[PDB]
Design a protein around this ligand. Sequence first.
Ligand SMILES: N[C@@H](Cc1ccccc1)C(=O)O
Ligand SMILES: N[C@@H](Cc1ccccc1)C(=O)O
Ligand SMILES: N[C@@H](Cc1ccccc1)C(=O)O
Ligand SMILES: N[C@@H](Cc1ccccc1)C(=O)O
Ligand SMILES: N[C@@H](Cc1ccccc1)C(=O)O
Ligand SMILES: [K+]
Ligand SMILES: [K+]
Ligand SMILES: [K+]
Ligand SMILES: [K+]
Ligand SMILES: [K+]
Lengths: 83, 83, 83, 83, 83
Amino acid sequence: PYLLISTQIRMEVGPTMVGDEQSDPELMQHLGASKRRALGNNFYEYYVDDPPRIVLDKLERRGFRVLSMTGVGQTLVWCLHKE
Amino acid sequence: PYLLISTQIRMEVGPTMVGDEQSDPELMQHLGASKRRALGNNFYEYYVDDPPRIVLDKLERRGFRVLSMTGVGQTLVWCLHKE
Amino acid sequence: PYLLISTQIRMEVGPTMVGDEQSDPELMQHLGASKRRALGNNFYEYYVDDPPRIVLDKLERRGFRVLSMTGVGQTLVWCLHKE
Amino acid sequence: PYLLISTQIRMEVGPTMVGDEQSDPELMQHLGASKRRALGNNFYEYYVDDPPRIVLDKLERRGFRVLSMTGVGQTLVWCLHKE
Amino acid sequence: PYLLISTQIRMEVGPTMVGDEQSDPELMQHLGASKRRALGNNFYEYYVDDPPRIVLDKLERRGFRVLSMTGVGQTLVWCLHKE
Ligand SMILES: N[C@@H](Cc1ccccc1)C(=O)O
Ligand SMILES: N[C@@H](Cc1ccccc1)C(=O)O
Ligand SMILES: N[C@@H](Cc1ccccc1)C(=O)O
Ligand SMILES: N[C@@H](Cc1ccccc1)C(=O)O
Ligand SMILES: N[C@@H](Cc1ccccc1)C(=O)O
Ligand SMILES: [K+]
Ligand SMILES: [K+]
Ligand SMILES: [K+]
Ligand SMILES: [K+]
Ligand SMILES: [K+]
């Protein structure tokens, strides 16, 4: 149902974080996401190389819509929901 | 009827703050929230170990909808409303 | 019709700013607000000791709805509208 | 059809910026706005002394609705859209 | 389709960034956008000289509506969606 995606520093370029370790594996696979650990983090996260505009387009085809977009520090976050 | 939840530094990992001293004890119990008074604070707060995506999903099953999401400092906040 | 409320540093505790000098005196009285002139300011504002979640609940009973919530600096602001 | 208004430092006091060089002159006149090229700026801007709550009320009477409110630096911005 | 546009420092003046390398070439041509690789960037971006209010008006004529507006660092971002 709810989904959070994000990008840092610039909105025109990836990586875009598209999930946490408990994310839907089917949706992560559909987006072409990989599990990667950022340096100075103990847990893996899902990410794609695509900029966020492309991820939003792909999520819409899976029935997700944007409820909110916000900036926090140097991170741009989108909150999406499936009916 | 209104609910404020938040997480700091990273959106994919908890803790997620889910209430203040005057929060609904039953809803706090339903979420599995722990009550605590953080270091140097003169008030209590409820929190869960879950990342905020999981808390948003649980709140929807209780009739809460996301009205807004915003960043402030290093905190990502959601404002929810019950039907 | 429009109303702006805010809180600083933490969302769980007040004070909550609920009005400027030209605010509706009856609504300020209904909320239990007091006037205060902050240090170095040439204007007074209305505030309550309650955390913002409690103010939002009171404002809903007066016909106000949340249109937006945003963070700016260390301030969390809500924009409300009456129909 | 789109309108951007803003205020800095505090939401309770003006000035409120209500337009750029290409704004509707009649709407600027209706709001009682003045032109003022500011220090460190090349462009002109329209502004009023009123706090933003009063400008939002006046804009509603002209058919504008608030679509979004956000913070950026020390600026609080509203994005409005005509019906 | 989703669209992300942005401006920095001041909302009244351009440039307005209107696309990434994979943006719709026809829409970029319609807006009169140019490609520009910023200092020390590994990618190109599309931009126009117009302030964002004018770009929002042009995008509405192409069927785009503003879903959200947010501040992140010194950047004001709009998230748009076509019907
Ligand atoms: N730590 C991130 C901001 C952030 C906070 C909370 C959740 C998500 C992201 C930054 O400085 O860019
Ligand atoms: N103090 C929080 C920001 C904040 C302000 C107001 C209310 C809630 C949170 C931070 O720096 O992360
Ligand atoms: N001055 C406030 C931010 C703010 C800006 C504009 C309007 C309202 C509040 C702070 O630093 O917390
Ligand atoms: N420069 C503004 C922030 C801002 C950025 C982009 C557009 C509008 C305003 C400030 O520091 O308050
Ligand atoms: N780097 C931008 C903020 C930003 C972060 C993420 C995406 C887009 C923009 C700034 O400091 O103004
Ligand atoms: K990025
Ligand atoms: K966290
Ligand atoms: K507070
Ligand atoms: K101000
Ligand atoms: K600009």
